[PDB]
Design a binder for these strands. Structure first.
Ligand SMILES: [Mg+2]
Ligand SMILES: [Mg+2]
Ligand SMILES: [Mg+2]
Lengths: 109, 51, 56, 236, 199
RNA sequence: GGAGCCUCGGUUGGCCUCGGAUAGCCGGUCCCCCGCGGGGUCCGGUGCGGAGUGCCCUUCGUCCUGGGAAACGGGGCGCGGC
RNA sequence: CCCCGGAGCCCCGCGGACGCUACGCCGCGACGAGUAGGAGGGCCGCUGCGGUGAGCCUUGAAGCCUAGGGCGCGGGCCCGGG
RNA sequence: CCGCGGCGGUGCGCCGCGACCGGCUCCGGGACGGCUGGGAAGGCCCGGCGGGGAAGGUGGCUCGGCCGAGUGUUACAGCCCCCCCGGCAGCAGCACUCGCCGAAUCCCGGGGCCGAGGGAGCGAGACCCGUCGCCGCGCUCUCCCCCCUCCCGGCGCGCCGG
C-alpha cells in the first residue's frame, strides 16, 4: 500500500570529460554516499518509468500510457556512493535529473 | 581448445599436474589439524585463567 | 632500463605466470599449454615432459 | 551397494588417498582371476494364407526432408532443471518471516513453511490474517526478516508439493476462430481440497503466531518505504 | 521536496558550488537572506574585485555588455550561474529550479530553512581571517534597497520571536503533560526506550 | 455532476526564534525593573547537543462481534460570526 | 581361434561426406594508422559485339517518382506501389 | 483423433528463473614461514646497583575551605622514570589490529558483473549415440559388523526386520 522502491536520480551517463559512453547510466541513489553504503544495491532491478502519448499494454493490467526501461545496478561508481547502472536500452537524456526507481527485488537479504 | 584456468579449475590443474591432488589434500588436513590445536591451546588458557 | 620493470621472481610467480598464462610456441603458433602432450612433444628431448618440469 | 568409502574433504577432494583406499576397499583379496544373414534379428508376427509374415518394428521412413541440421558436441555438464542442486539463503529458516516483494501480495508479510522440490519457497501469511494463502514464492523476491515463530512441530501435508501448486488450464483445438474459445472459462476456482489444506495448516501455525505479542498485527500490516528510511541503513 | 537555505553565515562561492550540483540533480532550491552571505578576504579586497567586474563592458554598446547585478540575490545567482552549463537547455533548466532572495519573503519566512555547514564561515575560515558581508558590498556598488531590506527583517524577527515564545509555551506544557500522565503512558514509554529513544 | 483529446513531473508531511562560536540551550525565580509577556541578577539542570534534522509528526490492508486499557474526540469538501 | 552384404560401430586398411563450384570446402596461430605512390580483388557500375538463358515484355519494356520491404563493409543491388 | 511418448529443429510478442563453464571485480574465514630464530608489550614477582625528573615531602609566597589548589628550591624514594646485573610458563608479526616481508612456507567458503557461439551420424533385417584425456571416487562381482532410520512388513508414539 506504499512505496516498494528506493529513490534515485539519473546523474548522467558514464563518461570521460569529452566522451560520454551512453550505454552506462550513473545513479545517485538517495541516502547513500560512500563506496561502502552501496553493496546493498549491487544487482538490483531498476526502472526508468515514464509516460507517453500513445497507449501501451501492461502486465496484469489494462492498457496504459506509462512505459518503462528496465535495468540493473552493476557496480559502485567512485567513493561518494554513486552507482553504475546498465539498462536494457540506453536511457533517453531527456531523463537527466529525473527519478529512476531502484527496486529491492533481486534480494540477497 | 578453450583454456580453462588451472588455478581455479581443480581438474585442469590435475590434468596438467596430478601431484596437486595430494598437495591440496594435505593443506586442508594440515590446516584443520592446526586449527583444532589452536582451540585446544585456547581452552587450556581459559582453564588456566579460571584456576 | 627506463623501458622496463624487472627483478627476481618468486616461486609462486613462476607458477602463476606459467599456469594462468603459459603458452607454447608450437610450429610458430602461440598455443595454450592445455596438456603436457604439447610440452613433451616439443621439450621432451630435454627430459622436460610436463608443466611441472618446465617450472623447475 | 555400499556407500562412499572415502568421505568428502572438499568438492572434488576425497579425505583419503589412492593408497588408503586400496586398503579400505581391500583390493588385496578382491582379485578377479578371469581368463544377421538368415537368422532375423528383431521383427516377427503371425498370419493366415501363404504362411507367417515377417513384420519390421521401427520401419524406415516415408519422407526425408531436403536438408536437416547435423547433431551437436556432447557438452559435459549441462543438467536439466530437475537434476539441479537447490540453494537457500541461510537467513530463510522454517517458521521465519518474509516480506514478499513482487506479486499481488506485494509488501504483505508472511510466514515461511518450506522449500519445495523446485527450489521455490512454500509460504503462508495465514490467509486469516493477511489474505495470503498456501503459496509458492522465490527466495530472490522476498526479504528474510529477522523475526521467527517456532514452527518446529507442525505436520505440513506431505501431499502438498510443487506439483500441486501448479497452474492448470487450456488445451489446443476447439472452435477457435471467431469471438470465442478460452478468452472465457473466466475464473480460477479455489476448489475444496485447497481450502481444506489451508484450514489444516493455518490452525497449527495460527496458535503459534498468536503466542508472540503483537505478531498477528505485524502480520496484518504491509511494508513500505517512507521518507528518510533507506533499505541499506535499516535491518530486516 | 524543496531546499530552503539561509544564505547567512555561508561563503559565496562555497555555497554556490553546493547549490549548483543540487540544482543539476533536479533538486529545487531556494536561497534566502542572500545579503547575509559573506565572502572571504577583507572587505576592500572584494570591493575592488567587484569594481573591476563593473569596468568590464562592451565598449561599442554597453547596453549589450555584461550586466552587473547589484542586489545580493542576483549576485549570488550570478555566481551559481557560473557553475552550471547555462548555455545548454539542461543548464537553463537547472537555474530555473534555483530561487534567490534578498532577505526572506513570505513563503519561506514561515518555513524551517537549512544550513550548509560545508559552506559556513565559522567552519571554513580561520577566525583571525577577514571577510566581507555581501550586503555592504552590494550597498556600496549601488544596491538601492539595503535599508528597506533591514526594516522588513526587523519586522520578521519580531514576528518570529512571538512564534517561538508560543512554541516554547507548548513544549513546556508538553513537558508538564508527560509528568501529569506518566503512570498511564508508562508501559508505552518503557518500550520506546528498549529500542533506544528517550535516553 | 458525466464522458474526452493532450502535457507531464511526482509516489507521506515538517506551520518559522535570534544568533553565538575563546561559547551556547532550558528552566525557575525567592528578588528587582519595564510594556499575560520583555530585561536583569541569583540559583538549579542539560552541553560531542535526546526540548537531538544522528531529529520530529503521521501510519500502511477492509470489515464483523465482544472483552479489557484509553475515552468526548472525529466527521458531514457540515454550516454562520470574530 | 570361422565370413563385416553384416564387427555393429570412437575405427574399421571391403566401400565411402550432409562436405568435394578442389579457382571448392575445412582447421589452427598471428596481425589490421596512412598522403604521394604501387599491386590485388570487385556476383560494383555504363554503352556495343559473339555466344547463351525454349529469359522477360501491351495480362505493360525503358525511364521517372516514392515517410513501402530488404540485402550488401562498400561500389551498388533486389523487390512493393505509383 | 488422444498421447505434448522418443528425436529433431521452434518460441507471435513481452518476461522471469535455474544450475554449468569462461573472464573479471570484490567480501568473509581460517592455516603457515622468516626476522635482532623479530622489536616492543603484557603478567608474576624477588634480590641488588646507581643516575634523572621531580614528591605522600619540606619551604617562601599566593588563592580557596589543619585540609584542598597554584608557583619556587635541594633532592633521598614512601609518584614515577632510566641504566646495570639474574629468571620465570603466555606467547603468537597478537582482535588490547603499536610498527614487516612473504606462501609448494596456502587453503576454504561467499557475493556483483559481462559473456556462452563451436557443433568428430545423410546405412540397406540389428543405437538416431555415445563421448577423448583427467579426477578419484563410488559401487559392485569379497566377506564382516555398527549405526541411524525413508519406503514397505511386523510387533509393542516406541522397538524389530530399503
Ligand atoms: Mg504512476
Ligand atoms: Mg591499412
Ligand atoms: Mg593514394
Amino acid at each position: 500500500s506504499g512505496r516498494l522502491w528506493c529513490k534515485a536520480i539519473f546523474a548522467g551517463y558514464k563518461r570521460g570529460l569529452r566522451n560520454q559512453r551512453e550505454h552506462t547510466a550513473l545513479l545517485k541513489i538517495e541516502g547513500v554516499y560512500a563506496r561502502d553504503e552501496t553493496e546493498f544495491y549491487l544487482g538490483k532491478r531498476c526502472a526508468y518509468v515514464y509516460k507517453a502519448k500513445n497507449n501501451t499494454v501492461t502486465p496484469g493490467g489494462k492498457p496504459n500510457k506509462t512505459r518503462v526501461i528496465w535495468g540493473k545496478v552493476t557496480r559502485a561508481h567512485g567513493n561518494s556512493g554513486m552507482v553504475r547502472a546498465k539498462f536494457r536500452s540506453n536511457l533517453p537524456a531527456k531523463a537527466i535529473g529525473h527519478r529512476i526507481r531502484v527496486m529491492l527485488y533481486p534480494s540477497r537479504i | 581448445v578453450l583454456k580453462k584456468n588451472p588455478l581455479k579449475n581443480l581438474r585442469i590443474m590435475l590434468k596438467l599436474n596430478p601431484y596437486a591432488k595430494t598437495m591440496r589434500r594435505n593443506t586442508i588436513l594440515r590446516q584443520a589439524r592446526n586449527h583444532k590445536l589452536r582451540v585446544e591451546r585456547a581452552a587450556a588458557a581459559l582453564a588456566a585463567k579460571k584456576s | 632500463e627506463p623501458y622496463i620493470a624487472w627483478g627476481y621472481p618468486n616461486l609462486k610467480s613462476v607458477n602463476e605466470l606459467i599456469y594462468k598464462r603459459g603458452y607454447g610456441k608450437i610450429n610458430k603458433k602461440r598455443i595454450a599449454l592445455t596438456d603436457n602432450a604439447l610440452i613433451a612433444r616439443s621439450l621432451g628431448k630435454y627430459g622436460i615432459i610436463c608443466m611441472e618440469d618446465l617450472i623447475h | 551397494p555400499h556407500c562412499s568409502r572415502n568421505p568428502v574433504l572438499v568438492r572434488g577432494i576425497g579425505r583419503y588417498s589412492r593408497s588408503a583406499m586400496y586398503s579400505r576397499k581391500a583390493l588385496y583379496k578382491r582379485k578377479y582371476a578371469a581368463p544377421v544373414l538368415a537368422t532375423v534379428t528383431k521383427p516377427v508376427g503371425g498370419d493366415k494364407n501363404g504362411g507367417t509374415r515377417v513384420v519390421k518394428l521401427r520401419k524406415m521412413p516415408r519422407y526425408y526432408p531436403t536438408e536437416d541440421v547435423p547433431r551437436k558436441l556432447l557438452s559435459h555438464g549441462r543438467k536439466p532443471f530437475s537434476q539441479h542442486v537447490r540453494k537457500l539463503r541461510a537467513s530463510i529458516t522454517p517458521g521465519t518471516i518474509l516480506i514478499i516483494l513482487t506479486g499481488r501480495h506485494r509488501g504483505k508479510r508472511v510466514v515461511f513453511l518450506k522449500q519445495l522440490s523446485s527450489g521455490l519457497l512454500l509460504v503462508t501469511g495465514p490467509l486469516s490474517l493477511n489474505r495470503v494463502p498456501l503459496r509458492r514464492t522465490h527466495q530472490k523476491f522476498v526479504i528474510a526478516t529477522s523475526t521467527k515463530i517456532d514452527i518446529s512441530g507442525v505436520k505440513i501435508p506431505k501431499h502438498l508439493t510443487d506439483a500441486y501448486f501448479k497452474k492448470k488450464q487450456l488445451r489446443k483445438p476447439r472452435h477457435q476462430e471467431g469471438e470465442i474459445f478460452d478468452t472465457e472459462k473466466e475464473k480460477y476456482e479455489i476448489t475444496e481440497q485447497r481450502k481444506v489444506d489451508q484450514k489444516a495448516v493455518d490452525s497449527q501455525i495460527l496458535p503459534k503466531i498468536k503466542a508472540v505479542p503483537q505478531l498477528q498485527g505485524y502480520l496484518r500490516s504491509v511494508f513500505a518505504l517512507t521518507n528518510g528510511v533507506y533499505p541499506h541503513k535499516l535491518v530486516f | 521536496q524543496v531546499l530552503v537555505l539561509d544564505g547567512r553565515g555561508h561563503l559565496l562561492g562555497r555555497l554556490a558550488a553546493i547549490v549548483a550540483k543540487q540544482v543539476l540533480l533536479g533538486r529545487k532550491v531556494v536561497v534566502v537572506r542572500c545579503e547575509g552571505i559573506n565572502i572571504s578576504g577583507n572587505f576592500y579586497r572584494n570591493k575592488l574585485k567587484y569594481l573591476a567586474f563593473l569596468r568590464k563592458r562592451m565598449n561599442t554598446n554597453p547596453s549589450r555588455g555584461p550586466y552587473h547585478f547589484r542586489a545580493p540575490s542576483r549576485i549570488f545567482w550570478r555566481t551559481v550561474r557560473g557553475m552550471l552549463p547555462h548555455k545548454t537547455k539542461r543548464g537553463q533548466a537547472a537555474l530555473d529550479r534555483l530561487k534567490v532572495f534578498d532577505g526572506i519573503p513570505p513563503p519561506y519566512d514561515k518555513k524551517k530553512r537549512m544550513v550548509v555547514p560545508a559552506a559556513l564561515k565559522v567552519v571554513r575560515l580561520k577566525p583571525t581571517r577577514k571577510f566581507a558581508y555581501l550586503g555592504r558590498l552590494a550597498h556600496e556598488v549601488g544596491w538601492k534597497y539595503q535599508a528597506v531590506t533591514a526594516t522588513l527583517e526587523e519586522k520578521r524577527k519580531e514576528k518570529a520571536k512571538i512564534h517561538y515564545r508560543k512554541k516554547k509555551q507548548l513544549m513546556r506544557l508538553r513537558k508538564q503533560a508527560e509528568k501529569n500522565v506518566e503512570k498511564k503512558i508508562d508501559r508505552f514509554t518503557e518500550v520506546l526506550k528498549t529500542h533506544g529513544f528517550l535516553v
